[PDB]
């Protein structure tokens, strides 16, 4: 679609590697660690999808 097709997404980075034939429905934000992240944040707390 022209600037659409947002229904198909992916994950560029995750906290840990997925197991063989493992499925993860949750899409929580990866914690930064060096800075407390509750909502949006900077270095390591971006949206995965």
């Amino acid at each position: 679609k022209v600037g659409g097709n947002y229904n198909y997404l992916y994950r560029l980075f995750r906290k840990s590697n997925l197991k063989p034939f493992e499925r993860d429905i949750s899409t929580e934000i990866y914690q930064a660690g060096n800075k407390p992240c509750n909502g949006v944040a900077g270095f390591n707390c971006y949206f995965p999808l």
């Binding site: 560029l12 980075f13 060096n34 800075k35 900077g42 270095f43 390591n44 971006y46």
Partner: protein
Amino acid sequence: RFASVYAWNRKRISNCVADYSVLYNFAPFFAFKCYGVSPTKLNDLCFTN
């Protein structure tokens, strides 16, 4: 003081430890984007230039 945009400088780093710890330099960044390389995974990668 930095240089202008029409006469931007370029510093070559080839014999130094690539410690990506930009967090202590004005951590509230206005625009921190990464292209091709993950933000947190960059600290554990080696390159040429």
